Design a protein around this motif. Sequence first.
Motif, PDB file in Angstrom:
ATOM      1  N   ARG A  64      -9.071  37.765  41.953  1.00 21.39           N
ATOM      2  CA  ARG A  64      -9.673  36.603  40.935  1.00 21.39           C
ATOM      3  C   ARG A  64      -9.509  35.630  41.791  1.00 21.39           C
ATOM      4  O   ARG A  64      -9.014  34.916  40.982  1.00 21.39           O
ATOM      5  CB  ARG A  64      -9.732  37.142  39.240  1.00 21.39           C
ATOM      6  N   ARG A  65      -9.415  35.478  43.215  1.00 22.33           N
ATOM      7  CA  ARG A  65      -9.110  34.254  43.380  1.00 22.33           C
ATOM      8  C   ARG A  65     -10.130  33.514  44.540  1.00 22.33           C
ATOM      9  O   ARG A  65      -9.732  32.653  45.075  1.00 22.33           O
ATOM     10  CB  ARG A  65      -7.775  34.614  44.586  1.00 22.33           C
ATOM     11  N   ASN A  66     -11.025  33.826  44.791  1.00 22.61           N
ATOM     12  CA  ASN A  66     -12.499  33.316  45.317  1.00 22.61           C
ATOM     13  C   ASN A  66     -13.292  32.659  43.741  1.00 22.61           C
ATOM     14  O   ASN A  66     -13.846  33.394  43.030  1.00 22.61           O
ATOM     15  CB  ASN A  66     -13.212  34.145  46.035  1.00 22.61           C
ATOM     16  N   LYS A  67     -13.675  31.325  44.247  1.00 25.26           N
ATOM     17  CA  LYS A  67     -14.589  31.230  43.464  1.00 25.26           C
ATOM     18  C   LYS A  67     -16.297  30.736  43.266  1.00 25.26           C
ATOM     19  O   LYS A  67     -16.531  31.352  44.437  1.00 25.26           O
ATOM     20  CB  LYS A  67     -14.568  29.131  42.311  1.00 25.26           C
ATOM     21  N   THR A  68     -16.970  31.777  42.273  1.00 26.98           N
ATOM     22  CA  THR A  68     -17.713  31.499  42.730  1.00 26.98           C
ATOM     23  C   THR A  68     -18.975  29.949  41.650  1.00 26.98           C
ATOM     24  O   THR A  68     -19.550  29.357  43.132  1.00 26.98           O
ATOM     25  CB  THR A  68     -18.765  32.298  42.161  1.00 26.98           C
TER      26      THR A  68
ATOM     27  N   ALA B 274     -29.417  23.448  37.668  1.00 26.37           N
ATOM     28  CA  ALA B 274     -30.201  23.264  38.643  1.00 26.37           C
ATOM     29  C   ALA B 274     -30.142  22.123  39.785  1.00 26.37           C
ATOM     30  O   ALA B 274     -30.703  21.826  40.725  1.00 26.37           O
ATOM     31  CB  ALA B 274     -31.939  23.683  38.858  1.00 26.37           C
ATOM     32  N   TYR B 275     -29.092  21.410  39.621  1.00 28.61           N
ATOM     33  CA  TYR B 275     -28.869  20.350  40.909  1.00 28.61           C
ATOM     34  C   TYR B 275     -28.531  21.184  41.766  1.00 28.61           C
ATOM     35  O   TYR B 275     -28.159  22.386  42.282  1.00 28.61           O
ATOM     36  CB  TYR B 275     -27.852  19.966  40.498  1.00 28.61           C
ATOM     37  N   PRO B 276     -29.078  20.558  43.236  1.00 28.85           N
ATOM     38  CA  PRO B 276     -29.854  19.230  43.646  1.00 28.85           C
ATOM     39  C   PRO B 276     -30.828  19.526  43.338  1.00 28.85           C
ATOM     40  O   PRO B 276     -32.141  18.102  43.280  1.00 28.85           O
ATOM     41  CB  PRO B 276     -29.675  19.159  45.288  1.00 28.85           C
ATOM     42  N   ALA B 277     -31.728  19.949  43.026  1.00 28.41           N
ATOM     43  CA  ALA B 277     -32.698  19.760  42.676  1.00 28.41           C
ATOM     44  C   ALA B 277     -33.681  18.698  41.397  1.00 28.41           C
ATOM     45  O   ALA B 277     -32.584  18.208  40.921  1.00 28.41           O
ATOM     46  CB  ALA B 277     -33.865  21.205  41.762  1.00 28.41           C
TER      47      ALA B 277
ATOM     48  N   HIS C 217     -22.327  26.886  42.010  1.00 23.31           N
ATOM     49  CA  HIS C 217     -22.786  27.936  42.705  1.00 23.31           C
ATOM     50  C   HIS C 217     -22.772  27.447  44.579  1.00 23.31           C
ATOM     51  O   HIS C 217     -23.452  27.264  44.580  1.00 23.31           O
ATOM     52  CB  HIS C 217     -24.329  29.269  42.624  1.00 23.31           C
ATOM     53  N   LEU C 218     -21.398  27.705  44.677  1.00 25.14           N
ATOM     54  CA  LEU C 218     -21.050  27.115  46.423  1.00 25.14           C
ATOM     55  C   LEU C 218     -21.896  27.663  46.535  1.00 25.14           C
ATOM     56  O   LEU C 218     -22.093  26.848  47.735  1.00 25.14           O
ATOM     57  CB  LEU C 218     -19.528  27.497  46.152  1.00 25.14           C
ATOM     58  N   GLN C 219     -21.941  29.142  47.210  1.00 24.72           N
ATOM     59  CA  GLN C 219     -22.715  29.583  48.524  1.00 24.72           C
ATOM     60  C   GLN C 219     -24.408  29.234  48.205  1.00 24.72           C
ATOM     61  O   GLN C 219     -25.500  29.078  49.570  1.00 24.72           O
ATOM     62  CB  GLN C 219     -22.559  31.217  48.230  1.00 24.72           C
ATOM     63  N   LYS C 220     -25.085  29.569  47.307  1.00 21.99           N
ATOM     64  CA  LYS C 220     -26.572  28.870  46.893  1.00 21.99           C
ATOM     65  C   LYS C 220     -26.672  27.340  46.938  1.00 21.99           C
ATOM     66  O   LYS C 220     -27.522  27.445  46.467  1.00 21.99           O
ATOM     67  CB  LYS C 220     -26.978  29.270  45.441  1.00 21.99           C
ATOM     68  N   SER C 221     -25.601  26.549  46.190  1.00 22.09           N
ATOM     69  CA  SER C 221     -25.344  25.226  46.476  1.00 22.09           C
ATOM     70  C   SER C 221     -26.550  24.545  45.272  1.00 22.09           C
ATOM     71  O   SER C 221     -27.268  23.316  45.925  1.00 22.09           O
ATOM     72  CB  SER C 221     -25.980  24.266  47.980  1.00 22.09           C
ATOM     73  N   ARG C 222     -26.348  25.510  44.569  1.00 15.30           N
ATOM     74  CA  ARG C 222     -27.045  25.112  43.401  1.00 15.30           C
ATOM     75  C   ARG C 222     -26.773  25.482  42.265  1.00 15.30           C
ATOM     76  O   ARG C 222     -25.454  26.505  42.207  1.00 15.30           O
ATOM     77  CB  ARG C 222     -28.888  26.174  43.549  1.00 15.30           C
TER      78      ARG C 222
END
Lengths: 87, 155, 50
Positions: free
Chosen positions: A10-14, A37-40, A27-32
Amino acid sequence: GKGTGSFGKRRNKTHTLCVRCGRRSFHLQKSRCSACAYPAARLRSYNWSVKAIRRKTTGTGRMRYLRNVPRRFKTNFREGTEAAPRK
Amino acid sequence: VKYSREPDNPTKSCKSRGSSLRVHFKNTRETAHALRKMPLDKAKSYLEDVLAHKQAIPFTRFCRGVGRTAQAKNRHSNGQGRWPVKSAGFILDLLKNAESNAEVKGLDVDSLYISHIQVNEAQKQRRRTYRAHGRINPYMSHPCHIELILSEKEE
Amino acid sequence: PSHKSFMIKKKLAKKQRQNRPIPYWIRMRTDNTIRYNAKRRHWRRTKLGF
RNA sequence: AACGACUCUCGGCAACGGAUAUCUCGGCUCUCGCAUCGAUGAAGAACGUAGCGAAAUGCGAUACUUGGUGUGAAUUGCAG
RNA sequence: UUCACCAAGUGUUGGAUUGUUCACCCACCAAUAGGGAACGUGAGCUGGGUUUAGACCGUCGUGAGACAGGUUAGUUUUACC
RNA sequence: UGUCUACUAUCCAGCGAAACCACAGCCAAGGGAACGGGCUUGGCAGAAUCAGCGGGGAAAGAAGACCCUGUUGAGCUUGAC
RNA sequence: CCAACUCAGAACUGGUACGGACAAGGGGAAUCCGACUGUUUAAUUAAAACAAAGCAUUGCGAUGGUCCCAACGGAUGUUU
RNA sequence: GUCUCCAAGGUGAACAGCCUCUGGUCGAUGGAACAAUGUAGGCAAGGGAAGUCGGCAAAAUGGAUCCGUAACUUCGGGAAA
RNA sequence: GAUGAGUAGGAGGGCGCGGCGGUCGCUGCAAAACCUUGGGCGCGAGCCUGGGCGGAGCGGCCGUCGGUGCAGAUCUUGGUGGUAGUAGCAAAUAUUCAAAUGAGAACUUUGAAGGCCGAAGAGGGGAAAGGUUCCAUGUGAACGGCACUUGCACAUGGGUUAGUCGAUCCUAAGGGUCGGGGGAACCCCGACAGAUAGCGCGUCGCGCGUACUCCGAAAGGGAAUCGGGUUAAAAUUCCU
RNA sequence: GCAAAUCGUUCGUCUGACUUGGGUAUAGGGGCGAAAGACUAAUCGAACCGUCUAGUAGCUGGUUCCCUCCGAAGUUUCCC
RNA sequence: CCCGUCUUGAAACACGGACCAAGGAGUCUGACAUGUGUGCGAGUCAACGGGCGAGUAAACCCGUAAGGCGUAAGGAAGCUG
RNA sequence: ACUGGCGAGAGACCGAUAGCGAACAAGUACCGCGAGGGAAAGAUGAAAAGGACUUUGAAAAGAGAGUCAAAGAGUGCUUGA
Ligand SMILES: [K+]
Ligand SMILES: [K+]
Ligand SMILES: [K+]
Ligand SMILES: [K+]
Ligand SMILES: [K+]
Ligand SMILES: [K+]
Ligand SMILES: [K+]
Ligand SMILES: [K+]
Ligand SMILES: [K+]
Ligand SMILES: [K+]
Ligand SMILES: [K+]
Ligand SMILES: [K+]
Ligand SMILES: [K+]
Ligand SMILES: [K+]
Ligand SMILES: [K+]
Ligand SMILES: [K+]
Ligand SMILES: [K+]
Ligand SMILES: [K+]
Ligand SMILES: [K+]
Ligand SMILES: [K+]
Ligand SMILES: [K+]
Ligand SMILES: [K+]
Ligand SMILES: [K+]
Ligand SMILES: [K+]
Ligand SMILES: [K+]
Ligand SMILES: [K+]
Ligand SMILES: [K+]
Ligand SMILES: [K+]
Ligand SMILES: [K+]
Ligand SMILES: [K+]
Ligand SMILES: [K+]
Ligand SMILES: [K+]
Ligand SMILES: [K+]
Ligand SMILES: [K+]
Ligand SMILES: [K+]
Ligand SMILES: [Mg+2]
Ligand SMILES: [Mg+2]
Ligand SMILES: [Mg+2]
Ligand SMILES: [Mg+2]
Ligand SMILES: [Mg+2]
Ligand SMILES: [Mg+2]
Ligand SMILES: [Mg+2]
Ligand SMILES: [Mg+2]
Ligand SMILES: [Mg+2]
Ligand SMILES: [Mg+2]
Ligand SMILES: [Mg+2]
Ligand SMILES: [Mg+2]
Ligand SMILES: [Mg+2]
Ligand SMILES: [Mg+2]
Ligand SMILES: [Mg+2]
Ligand SMILES: [Mg+2]
Ligand SMILES: [Mg+2]
Ligand SMILES: [Mg+2]
Ligand SMILES: [Mg+2]
Ligand SMILES: [Mg+2]
Ligand SMILES: [Mg+2]
Ligand SMILES: [Mg+2]
Ligand SMILES: [Mg+2]
Ligand SMILES: [Mg+2]
Ligand SMILES: [Mg+2]
Ligand SMILES: [Mg+2]
Ligand SMILES: [Mg+2]
Ligand SMILES: [Mg+2]
Ligand SMILES: [Mg+2]
Ligand SMILES: [Mg+2]
Ligand SMILES: [Mg+2]
Ligand SMILES: [Mg+2]
Ligand SMILES: [Mg+2]
Ligand SMILES: [Mg+2]
Ligand SMILES: [Mg+2]
Ligand SMILES: [Mg+2]
Ligand SMILES: [Mg+2]
Ligand SMILES: [Mg+2]
Ligand SMILES: [Mg+2]
Ligand SMILES: [Mg+2]
Ligand SMILES: [Mg+2]
Ligand SMILES: [Mg+2]
Ligand SMILES: [Mg+2]
Ligand SMILES: [Mg+2]
Ligand SMILES: [Mg+2]
Ligand SMILES: [Mg+2]
Ligand SMILES: [Mg+2]
Ligand SMILES: [Mg+2]
Ligand SMILES: [Mg+2]
Ligand SMILES: [Mg+2]
Ligand SMILES: [Mg+2]
Ligand SMILES: [Mg+2]
Ligand SMILES: [Mg+2]
Ligand SMILES: [Mg+2]
Ligand SMILES: [Mg+2]
Ligand SMILES: [Mg+2]
Ligand SMILES: [Mg+2]
Ligand SMILES: [Mg+2]
Ligand SMILES: [Mg+2]
Ligand SMILES: [Mg+2]
Ligand SMILES: [Mg+2]
Ligand SMILES: [Mg+2]
Ligand SMILES: [Mg+2]
Ligand SMILES: [Mg+2]
Ligand SMILES: [Mg+2]
Ligand SMILES: [Mg+2]
Ligand SMILES: [Mg+2]
Ligand SMILES: [Mg+2]
Ligand SMILES: [Mg+2]
Ligand SMILES: [Mg+2]
Ligand SMILES: [Mg+2]
Ligand SMILES: [Mg+2]
Ligand SMILES: [Mg+2]
Ligand SMILES: [Mg+2]
Ligand SMILES: [Mg+2]
Ligand SMILES: [Mg+2]
Ligand SMILES: [Mg+2]
Ligand SMILES: [Mg+2]
Ligand SMILES: [Mg+2]
Ligand SMILES: [Mg+2]
Ligand SMILES: [Mg+2]
Ligand SMILES: [Mg+2]
Ligand SMILES: [Mg+2]
Ligand SMILES: [Mg+2]
Ligand SMILES: [Mg+2]
Ligand SMILES: [Mg+2]
Ligand SMILES: [Mg+2]
Ligand SMILES: [Mg+2]
Ligand SMILES: [Mg+2]
Ligand SMILES: [Mg+2]
Ligand SMILES: [Mg+2]
Ligand SMILES: [Mg+2]
Ligand SMILES: [Mg+2]
Ligand SMILES: [Mg+2]
Ligand SMILES: [Mg+2]
Ligand SMILES: [Mg+2]
Ligand SMILES: [Mg+2]
Ligand SMILES: [Mg+2]
Ligand SMILES: [Mg+2]
Ligand SMILES: [Zn+2]
């Protein structure tokens, strides 16, 4: 191994902190952000969660500017004048 | 403040109490049960012998699983007894406090006997312990209130 | 970790400041009901979530 | 088959617990009045800010407040 | 050796093959009788079989699948009242 | 079958849970919802307590997964609509 | 003049002990299944199941075969 | 459960096992007894799988040097036969 | 004068709780609630009363109204038992002696001895992750499943110093986009339908100019720091 | 229970279809699958969260004061 | 013989129930129907609204060719009554 | 028309397991990677007058005394099943 052993990894942050709403929901990979719902441009809101709406709706925060509108309305938004100096 | 039982002669009696003492209620009740109606001098020596493992405190009520010893046969025929030093220590402190109260009142310490002593359950304190399959159970302590009264032996 | 962003370090600093007992003179105010700090946090018991 | 222990039982007192009674700067419901957010940067989020404060409330480096006006002698837990 | 009487006091076994109950054979023995006790007995065991989920064959079914047909692998929990 | 070592159990100081619990807890027969701790008729029956034990409590664990019923589903199939 | 440690042999010797602790294949004759190495039901099945090289069949010459997509377009395709 | 860097001496083929130096550490609640049952580790006369569904478990084999090595075979193996 | 069973079910007359409209009262000379081996009434639901506790409200009667009466629902929330001082504390070889400190020492500290990890460590670092657990002093309780004078607990204060170590820069798989094309819209495709970005040289002019100056690596690529010394706690960062 | 899969011994493989960190892509009738209906955060023969929703139930359980009076039926016909 | 419960049948080896407190289940609304009370009666109804009024969500007043139900039925209907 | 916003009045409504989830630093503490989930928790006295001092104990604290109409109101303290 699906249980206790798997919980050891459990050492990777979603999600990280959202720049806009401040929750640990970006959510880092989705950039969302899953919460706002930022950056919407528009905020994330759903009528199927009454509780979610009232947690984040107007008035739950500081109302930094909106709190003074009623006072200015009562004076008809008068500006550029002052009370007469005391005698 | 108010003790469950009042001395027959308040002028000839002294008393002391302890509240929420961190000692097992069941062990302390057995120790108190062995001291009732006992002279103060004998009671103090008797409790000191318990601390030295020379005399045992019989267990009559909360005795399931308690071992058997020869030191308890005189007071308890079937031989169930133990040496609850922690309970004896708290009661010994109470006896000394009551004795000092007698000196202030100018009573005859040599004739004092335990006329009243009882142990009541105090508020339980909460810890927890971990069990198999990710379960949590209570891990409680059972403190007690202790009150005693020493009365002079009337001729 | 030792490698940390400025933003996170600032947030951690504020949490440290908030993790203190209430001043003693607070309990002596008129009509006071604040008994203690109800939001105390220990690093090992409850995690900050960020 | 006394005494005493144990168990059960009745009463007094003492414990344990927070029911009941009496309360209520809260809630709920009905009715009425008003029409006033934002690129002149809103709502929301963050950080800071007091002689002694963490929170709540307030405020923005002029930071639990500046200024004007009204009121007319306090603030107060302590200190000054 | 056979039939029958009183009689349940004592005893009634070691093995090959089969998960077996049953059976069958080898050998010993005075004898290798028959049964009950929730078809005694799984918080006594064992888990070979049967009777979950994997898999194979044959037959059946267009098919998903089926088979008092065969086959192989398959967690046996708790007593301190 | 015997025996040896360690750690337990065992005894003590300190600490200290849980499952479970209608009320309870000695038997035989009888009758009975056809297999009683309680009822009927008998045997009997003497405080308190320790270590073990697995016969019974049709012991505990779980609103039987087997089977059937319901005008309840769901996965899958096809020559069902 | 300066050299390191591999191999071989001989005598003597101990209560035949000597890879003295440690370490570290049991072996053989056959049947069934799968060629092999590999993979698989995390928490009851590791297998004869899956994969595999090999073998065979089918579609397609880009205005195409197979496939994704609400639409626009896209994957195979930096391909033939 | 969780990625990676540094790595001494002896024995030995060996960052195998066993012992040691640098560094670290005696942190696992203690005391007294030595019953049954248990868990872990062993041993055993004579027999040697008669046990059991079944050699389950355990025992036996084990390093190195020399000698020697069958059936079968896709000629590579089999073979440490 | 006759007559008396009753599940499912029906109905009547009554009891009790909380309001409202009225009416009649009680109460600091002690209301409500609660307690009682006090007494009495009613077939019964219940009612009346003595005593106690308590310290500010309450009741009768008529009418009328309702979130109006519990033993159960593997009922809900809270509390509390028996079980029970019972099950249990048992992996990782191990402790012992003396002294100091302290109210208190099998468990703190020093010294001595006996053991273990045995360099793929129980040693010395770092990346993630944590976030003050780091250091000093002190400590009532609680907590550290025995204990503690102890501390990763609690209280107060202190502590992280860089042109050279990293991030920062570059691009990778990929991500986010302009225009254009889709789409009621949220959105989809993603430099593919397009007057690119600008750069260079002279001093505003000439030349060049293929639609992203974007994000994406604390293990890829990559400008430059070494000894010696220094703190209770920092250093290739402080001092020389 | 040390543990909602661990511990002991014993075992498979160990230069490769090898092991592993980080980054990155694929999302719910969808993904991913050397294929076990496996896996997709202790959840998989269709995840998780909120809502529609107090979903429906010919089925199970429960259903709260007193006396008094009267007092049954398990039979007919029709009904997926 | 232990209560509650389903049942032809429960003390049952049928299920729920360790114990206490408090909470805890035929209600509100629309339509219709029988019955009963009340008012008026071939009528009845102040219902939308208006006029007002306890300075007033009440009460009081208003139906002028309003409207509902009733006062006439039969027929698919044209119609007749 | 108006269960949002701001201001105002009212009630045969609830009275701390009730009433909004929230009478209180409540959308807070806490849980979840996340979408989300989401509590418990009100009452000393008229006035702190919140218990000086003596004595015992390492300390907590007890005994006596003191304040108060009352500590049989002693900082989660009205009543106290
Ligand atoms: K015992
Ligand atoms: K008694
Ligand atoms: K009593
Ligand atoms: K109340
Ligand atoms: K702004
Ligand atoms: K603030
Ligand atoms: K002002
Ligand atoms: K048994
Ligand atoms: K197997
Ligand atoms: K003990
Ligand atoms: K019988
Ligand atoms: K299914
Ligand atoms: K291999
Ligand atoms: K194509
Ligand atoms: K033993
Ligand atoms: K055998
Ligand atoms: K009244
Ligand atoms: K009474
Ligand atoms: K009434
Ligand atoms: K690290
Ligand atoms: K730098
Ligand atoms: K880099
Ligand atoms: K490279
Ligand atoms: K230097
Ligand atoms: K290995
Ligand atoms: K789905
Ligand atoms: K039915
Ligand atoms: K029933
Ligand atoms: K039944
Ligand atoms: K029952
Ligand atoms: K009319
Ligand atoms: K009118
Ligand atoms: K007609
Ligand atoms: K609540
Ligand atoms: K009081
Ligand atoms: Mg899973
Ligand atoms: Mg990811
Ligand atoms: Mg991004
Ligand atoms: Mg025992
Ligand atoms: Mg445990
Ligand atoms: Mg766990
Ligand atoms: Mg943690
Ligand atoms: Mg969280
Ligand atoms: Mg303020
Ligand atoms: Mg016989
Ligand atoms: Mg056999
Ligand atoms: Mg039979
Ligand atoms: Mg049987
Ligand atoms: Mg049995
Ligand atoms: Mg069994
Ligand atoms: Mg059996
Ligand atoms: Mg089997
Ligand atoms: Mg099967
Ligand atoms: Mg066929
Ligand atoms: Mg089988
Ligand atoms: Mg019997
Ligand atoms: Mg019984
Ligand atoms: Mg009898
Ligand atoms: Mg007896
Ligand atoms: Mg038994
Ligand atoms: Mg047993
Ligand atoms: Mg049962
Ligand atoms: Mg069932
Ligand atoms: Mg079921
Ligand atoms: Mg049905
Ligand atoms: Mg039917
Ligand atoms: Mg269906
Ligand atoms: Mg053959
Ligand atoms: Mg194979
Ligand atoms: Mg696997
Ligand atoms: Mg498995
Ligand atoms: Mg396996
Ligand atoms: Mg072939
Ligand atoms: Mg198209
Ligand atoms: Mg060597
Ligand atoms: Mg080695
Ligand atoms: Mg032998
Ligand atoms: Mg021998
Ligand atoms: Mg032999
Ligand atoms: Mg045999
Ligand atoms: Mg045999
Ligand atoms: Mg074996
Ligand atoms: Mg061979
Ligand atoms: Mg009758
Ligand atoms: Mg009343
Ligand atoms: Mg009584
Ligand atoms: Mg009354
Ligand atoms: Mg009400
Ligand atoms: Mg009700
Ligand atoms: Mg009840
Ligand atoms: Mg009932
Ligand atoms: Mg219950
Ligand atoms: Mg409960
Ligand atoms: Mg209990
Ligand atoms: Mg024990
Ligand atoms: Mg153990
Ligand atoms: Mg021990
Ligand atoms: Mg050990
Ligand atoms: Mg130790
Ligand atoms: Mg070792
Ligand atoms: Mg060693
Ligand atoms: Mg290495
Ligand atoms: Mg402790
Ligand atoms: Mg430290
Ligand atoms: Mg701290
Ligand atoms: Mg650098
Ligand atoms: Mg790219
Ligand atoms: Mg996009
Ligand atoms: Mg565009
Ligand atoms: Mg182009
Ligand atoms: Mg760039
Ligand atoms: Mg970049
Ligand atoms: Mg690099
Ligand atoms: Mg350092
Ligand atoms: Mg352990
Ligand atoms: Mg799709
Ligand atoms: Mg795979
Ligand atoms: Mg299958
Ligand atoms: Mg849901
Ligand atoms: Mg029909
Ligand atoms: Mg039946
Ligand atoms: Mg019954
Ligand atoms: Mg029976
Ligand atoms: Mg049932
Ligand atoms: Mg039950
Ligand atoms: Mg009630
Ligand atoms: Mg009528
Ligand atoms: Mg008309
Ligand atoms: Mg006609
Ligand atoms: Mg409004
Ligand atoms: Mg509430
Ligand atoms: Mg109430
Ligand atoms: Mg009062
Ligand atoms: Mg009180
Ligand atoms: Zn956000």
